[PDB]
Structure 1
Amino acid sequence: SSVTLYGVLDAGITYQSNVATPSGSGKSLWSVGAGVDQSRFGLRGSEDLGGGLKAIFTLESGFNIGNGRFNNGGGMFNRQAFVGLSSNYGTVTLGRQYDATQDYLSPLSATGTWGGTYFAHPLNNDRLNTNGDVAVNNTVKFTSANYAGLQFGGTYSFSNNSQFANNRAYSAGASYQFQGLKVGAAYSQANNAGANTTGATDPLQGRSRVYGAGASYAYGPLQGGLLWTQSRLDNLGAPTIRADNYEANVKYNLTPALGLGVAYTYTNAKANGESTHWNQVGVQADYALSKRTDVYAQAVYQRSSKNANASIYNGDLSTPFSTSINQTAATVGLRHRFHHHHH
Structure 2
Amino acid sequence: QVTLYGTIKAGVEVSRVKDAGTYKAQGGKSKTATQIADFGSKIGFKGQEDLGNGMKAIWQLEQKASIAGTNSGWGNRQSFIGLKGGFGTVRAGNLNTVLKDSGDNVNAWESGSNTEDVLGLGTIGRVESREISVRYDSPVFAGFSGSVQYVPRDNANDVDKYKHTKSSRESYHAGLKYENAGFFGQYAGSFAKYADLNTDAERVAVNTANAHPVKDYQVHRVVAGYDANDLYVSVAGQYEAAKNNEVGSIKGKKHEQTQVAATAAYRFGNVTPRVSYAHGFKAKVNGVKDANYQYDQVIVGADYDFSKRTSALVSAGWLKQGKGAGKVEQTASMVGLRHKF
Fold equivalence (TM over 0.5): yes
What are the superposed Cα offsets for residues 106-152 of structure 1, whole Å, 9 maximum, x if unpaired?
Answer: 2321x1x355642224274332xxxxxx1011x11011111111111
Secondary structure in 1 aligned to 2:5? strand
Distance 1:114 1:192, change over 3 A: closer
Asked if the contact 2:99–2:173 (Cα under 8 Å) also holds between the matched residues in 1, the reply is yes
Structure 1 residues 240-275: Cα deviation after superposition (integer angstroms, max 9, x where no partner)? 3322111111011121x2111101001113323223
Q: Is the 8 A contact 2:103 2:125 kept in 1?
A: no
Q: Deviation per CA, 1:161-184, whole angstroms, max 9, x where unpaired? A: 233853322211100111211110
TM-superposed deviation, 1:232: 2.7
Aligned partner of 1:3: which letter? V
2:278 to 265, 272, 293: 265
Relative distance call for 1:170 and 1:201 in structure 2 (3 A) is farther
Evaluate the alpha carbon distance shift between residue 67 and residue 240 of structure 1 in structure 2; reply closer, same or farther with a 3 A threshold: farther
Unaligned 5+ segments in structure 2 are 155-160
Match of 1:131 in 2: none
Query: After superposition, where does 1:215-226 map in structure 2 within 5 Å?
Result: 215-226=224-235
- The structural deviation recorded for 1:16 is 1.4
Counterpart Cα distance in 1 of 2:167 and 2:143 = 35
Higher Rg of the two aligned structures: 2
Is 1:303 matched with 2:338? no
State how far apart, in whole Å, the 2-side matches of 1:308 and 1:140 are: 46
Q: Secondary structure at the match of 1:254?
A: coil
Q: Deviations over 1:61-81 (max 9, x none)?
A: 1133334324xxxx5211112
Residue 95 of structure 2 is aligned to residue 97 of structure 1: yes
Name the CA distance, whole Å, in 2 between partners of 1:273 and 1:146: 43
Q: 1:231 to 1:307 in 2, by over 3 A?
A: farther
Write the deviation string for residues 42-72 of structure 1: whole angstroms up to 9, x where unpaired. Answer: 11111111221110111111133334324xx
Higher RCO (C-alpha 8 Å, min separation 6) = 1
Number of residue pairs matched?
Answer: 302
1:22 CA displacement: 6.4
Inter-CA distance 336–120: structure 2 relative to 1 (3 Å threshold): same
Q: Distance in 2 between matches of 1:233 and 1:33?
A: 35
Distance 1:250 1:24 in 2: 38
Which segments of 5 or more consecutive residues in structure 1 lack a partner in the other structure?
A: 128-133, 310-323, 339-343
1:13 aligned partner? 12
Q: Is the 8 A contact 1:115 1:261 kept in 2?
A: no
State TM-score, norm by structure 1. Answer: 0.80
Letter in 1 for 2:121: A
Q: What is the alpha-carbon distance in structure 2 between the residues aligned to residue 302 and residue 23 of structure 1?
A: 17
RMSD: 2.6
Q: TM-score, normalised by structure 2?
A: 0.80
Q: Kindly, what percent of the aligned residue pairs are identical?
A: 27
The amino acid of 2:47's aligned partner reads G
Is the 1:125–1:231 contact (alpha carbons within 8 Å) kept by the matching residues of 2?
Answer: no
After the TM superposition, list the runs of 4 or more consecutive aligned residues in structure 1 that deviate by more than 4 angstroms.
19-25, 200-204
Which of 274, 284, 288 is the aligned partner of 2:301? 284
Q: 1:7 to 1:33 in 2, by over 3 A?
A: same
**Aligned-partner SS, 1:274:** strand
**From 70, 75, 78, the counterpart of 1:68:** 70
Report the Cα distance in structure 1 between the residues aligned to 2:231 and 2:136, rounded to whole angstroms: 32
Indicate conservation of the 8 Å contact 1:18/1:29, yes or no. no
What is the CA–CA distance in structure 2 between the aligned matches of 1:31 and 1:241, rounded to whole Å? Answer: 37
Give 3-state SS (helix, strand or coil) of 1:55's partner: strand
**One-letter code aligned to 2:214:** G
Worse-matched range after superposition: 281-290 or 159-168: 159-168
Per-residue CA distance 1:166-211 (angstroms, 9 max, x = gap): 332221110011121111001212333589xxxx965762243321
The 2-side partners of 1:335 and 1:308 are apart by 39
- Mapping of 1:130-209 within 5 angstroms? 134-137=129-132, 139-160=133-154, 161-162=161-162, 163=164, 165-190=167-192, 191-193=194-196, 202=205, 205-207=213-215, 208-209=217-218
